[PDB]
Amino acid sequence: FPATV
Amino acid sequence: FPATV
Amino acid sequence: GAMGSMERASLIQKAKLAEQAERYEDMAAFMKGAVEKGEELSCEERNLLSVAYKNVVGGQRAAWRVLSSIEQKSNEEGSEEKGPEVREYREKVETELQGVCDTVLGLLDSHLIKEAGDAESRVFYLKMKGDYYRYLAEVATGDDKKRIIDSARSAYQEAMDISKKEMPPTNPIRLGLALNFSVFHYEIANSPEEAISLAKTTFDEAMADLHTLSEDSYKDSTLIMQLLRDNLTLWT
Amino acid sequence: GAMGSMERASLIQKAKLAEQAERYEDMAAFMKGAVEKGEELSCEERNLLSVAYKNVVGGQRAAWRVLSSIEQKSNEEGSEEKGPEVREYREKVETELQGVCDTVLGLLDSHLIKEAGDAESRVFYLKMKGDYYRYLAEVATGDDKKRIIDSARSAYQEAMDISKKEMPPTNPIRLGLALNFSVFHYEIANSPEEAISLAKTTFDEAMADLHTLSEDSYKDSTLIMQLLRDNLTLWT
Ligand SMILES: *CC(=O)NCC1CCN(C(=O)C2(Oc3ccc(Cl)cc3)CCC(F)(F)CC2)CC1
Ligand SMILES: *CC(=O)NCC1CCN(C(=O)C2(Oc3ccc(Cl)cc3)CCC(F)(F)CC2)CC1
Ligand SMILES: [Mg+2]
Ligand SMILES: [Mg+2]
Ligand SMILES: [Mg+2]
Ligand SMILES: [Mg+2]
Ligand SMILES: [Mg+2]
Ligand SMILES: [Mg+2]
């Protein structure tokens, strides 16, 4: 899964 | 802390 | 509701304690209570709110993905019928997740966003609005899927427009917003080229502004820039 | 209560799903529901019950220790007063922890233990009884501290007596029981020599019986023996 903040 | 199961 | 009798300052203090104890459900309830006092939130307070609900919904999303994967496998050819239990339990977790998203969106709509006049606060809350509609979108399968997606897009877009006008390209909120909107494009909107373009442009414009920053601001900006790079590497 | 309308088999199925999703609160509620159907539990089912509540109370204990440490520091000389919030929140977590322990002890008393005739089941449940009284003991500070400690000791002792009579020295339940009763002696009963003696004797008697075991039984036994050794190393 891609990075989010 | 010591091991318990 | 149940936090109505506790002082705002005590709720904030307890949210910080809950964070230290990794009690994110408690942390979220305390911050919900704080928001419902009706006063605007400081930067530190906005961070407590976002951290709490990020962790709560993060756990729910992880569990939903586990259960969805099991459910998908049960609907493949050759799988020997197991009854409604997998679907029922995925639905239970899904409903709880949607409840948390609705709660957060409720707080933003009553009345965090409308009272947020400064760019830093308004963008922070609009990013959250985008994020929690994105989480709703991840589990949406019905007649409202398109409207949920457009609600996420609309929130992210308003946030982007303000951030571009009002904040430097290295601002961590601006960077984090772009990171997440990029993920929205890739994972939700079926727009991988838009996702890649946004991540690239955001990275490059931040790179060119790093020279203006102190060591501490440089640290936060470069951390998020590395996340943009990580996604680009994942996608190309 | 709320699980009264769900099939026993469905509750068991959902407990297994919750475990896979790391949803231990749900897992515990499902198993509570299963127990309340009134039928005895199989070995697999007893494991689901214990795993669920171990994880739930494990998290609560970790949080309580964090909060207790903060509270202790706030009562040292030179610490500038912060109000009742630390104590209040530690109390909240403590009360929730005690509630979970009371719930488990309730299930054991109504009516798991009384219906458990086989050594393996009776020892398993009595060990749990000892464990959940030990967790109560960890947070006890009042007039009931001594009675709580003796309740833990009594449960562990009955379990030990049955296990010595009825099970081989390598039996994983017998080993795990001894491990935990040893920790009880060290951490709760202020009897470190008894703790060390029990761990040593248990280890040595298991070592001498390993020759009787298959590769799979050998694996489980030696794993717990390593925990006994780890504690001995910690204590000597
Ligand atoms: C009030 C305020 O300015 N809050 C934003 C602030 C940004 C930096 N930060 C972080 O924890 C990290 O970055 C972001 C978190 C949230 C948002 Cl909305 C944007 C950025 C966390 C990720 C990181 F890569 F480690 C960099 C810092 C504190 C809150
Ligand atoms: C019904 C039944 O026989 N249950 C006991 C069984 C023992 C082995 N096991 C484990 O998960 C490990 O050991 C114990 C767990 C619980 C108890 Cl009460 C005793 C032992 C977990 C620790 C280990 F070191 F990894 C060895 C196996 C499954 C349940
Ligand atoms: Mg007040
Ligand atoms: Mg649904
Ligand atoms: Mg563009
Ligand atoms: Mg039935
Ligand atoms: Mg108390
Ligand atoms: Mg002896």
Q: Do C112 and C75 touch, CB atoms closer than 8 A?
A: no
- Residue C48 C-alpha to ligand 1 middle, in angstroms? 11
- Tokens representing residue D20 in the block: 């896979």
Which residues of D fall within a CB distance of 8 Å from C26?
A: 89, 92
- Report the alpha-carbon distance of residue D230 to residue D171 in Å, rounded: 19
Query: Hey, how many other C-beta atoms are within 10 angstroms of the C-beta on C55?
Result: 17
| Residues across chain A | 5
Q: Do B2 and D224 touch (CB under 8 A)?
A: no
**Which ligand gives the minimal distance to the CA of C116?**
1
User: Which amino acid does the sequence have at C147?
Assistant: R
- Tokens representing residue C112 in the block: 């965090």
| Residues across chain D | 236
CA atoms C129, C132, C138, C144: torsion sign: negative
Out of C21, C70, C93, the one facing D67 most closely (by C-beta) is C21
C130 touches chain A (CB under 8 A): no
Method: X-ray
- Chains touching chain C, criterion 3+ CB pairs below 8 Å: A, D
Nearest to C4 by CA among C40, C30, C39, C41: C30
- Residue C150 C-alpha to ligand 5 middle, in angstroms? 18
C173 CB near ligand 1 (under 6 Å):
yes
DSSP class of C211? G
Asked if omega into D185 is within 30° of 0 (cis), the reply is no
Q: Which atom of ligand 1 is nearest to the CA of C176?
A: 19
Which residues are CB-neighbours of C13 under 8 A, at least 6 positions away?
D82, D83, D85
- Report the alpha-carbon distance of residue D136 to residue D99 in Å, rounded: 10
Q: Which CATH architecture has domain D8-235?
A: Up-down Bundle (1.20)
Which residues of C fall within a CB distance of 8 Å from A2?
A: 183, 186-187, 230-231, 234-235
User: What is residue C121's three-state secondary structure?
Assistant: helix
- Tokens representing residue D41 in the block: 């539990």
**Helices D119-139 + D172-187 axis angle, to 10:** 20
Query: Hey, how many other C-beta atoms are within 10 angstroms of the C-beta on D201?
Result: 14
C224 CB near ligand 1 (under 6 Å):
yes
* Å between A1 CA and nearest CA of chain C: 9
- Report the alpha-carbon distance of residue C152 to residue C137 in Å, rounded: 8
Which residues are CB-neighbours of C192 under 8 A, at least 6 positions away?
C185, C186, C235
Q: Do B2 and D131 touch (CB under 8 A)?
A: no
CA atoms D102, D107, D110, D113: torsion sign: negative
Q: Do C12 and C48 touch, CB atoms closer than 8 A?
A: yes
| Residues across chain B | 5
User: What is residue C123's three-state secondary structure?
Assistant: helix
Dihedral, D92, D147, D227, D186 alpha carbons, nearest 10: 100
- Report the alpha-carbon distance of residue D25 to residue C25 in Å, rounded: 12
Q: Do D85 and C14 touch (CB under 8 A)?
A: yes
Tell the residue number behind the tokens 């007893």, with chain if given: D46
**Which ligand gives the minimal distance to the CA of C41?**
1
Q: Do C93 and D21 touch, CB atoms closer than 8 A?
A: yes
Q: Do C100 and C57 touch, CB atoms closer than 8 A?
A: yes
Q: Do C14 and D82 touch (CB under 8 A)?
A: no
User: What is residue C5's three-state secondary structure?
Assistant: coil
B3 CB near ligand 2 (under 6 Å):
no
Which residues of A fall within a CB distance of 8 Å from C176?
A: 5
Which protein residues have their CB within 5 A of the ion that is ligand 3?
Answer: C 7
Q: Do B5 and D224 touch (CB under 8 A)?
A: yes
Query: Hey, how many other C-beta atoms are within 10 angstroms of the C-beta on D118?
Result: 11
DSSP codes, C136-167: HHHH--STTHHHHHHHHHHHHHHHHHHHHHHS
Q: Do D127 and D47 touch, CB atoms closer than 8 A?
A: no
- Report the alpha-carbon distance of residue C160 to residue C176 in Å, rounded: 11
Asked if omega into D211 is within 30° of 0 (cis), the reply is no
Q: Using H for helix, E for strand and C for coil, what is the string for chain D? A: CCCCCCCHHHHHHHHHHHHHCCCHHHHHHHHHHHHCCCCCCCHHHHHHHHHHHHHHHHHHHHHHHHHHHHHHHHCCCCCCCCCCHHHHHHHHHHHHHHHHHHHHHHHHHHHHHHHCCCHHHHHHHHHHHHHHHHHHHHHCCCCCHHHHHHHHHHHHHHHHHHHHHHCCCCCHHHHHHHHHHHHHHHHCCCCHHHHHHHHHHHHHHHHCCHHHCCHHHHHHHHHHHHHHHHHHHHHC
- Report the alpha-carbon distance of residue C10 to residue C15 in Å, rounded: 8
List helix spans (H) across C108-118.
113-115
Which residues are CB-neighbours of D172 under 8 A, at least 6 positions away?
D220, D221, D224
Q: Which H or E run contains C106?
A: helix C85-107
- First vs last C-alpha separation in chain B: 13
| Residues across chain C | 236
Resolution (A): 1.8
User: What is residue A5's three-state secondary structure?
Assistant: coil
* Residue ranges of domains in chain D: 8-235
- Tokens representing residue D141 in the block: 């500070």
C-alpha angle D73-C49-D96 in degrees, rounded to nearest 5:
55
Q: Which H or E run contains C78?
A: none
- Tokens representing residue C118 in the block: 């400064």
Q: Please, is C96 exposed, middle or buried when counting C-beta atoms within 10 Å of its C-beta (0-12, 13-18, 19+)?
A: middle
- Residue C198 C-alpha to ligand 5 middle, in angstroms? 6
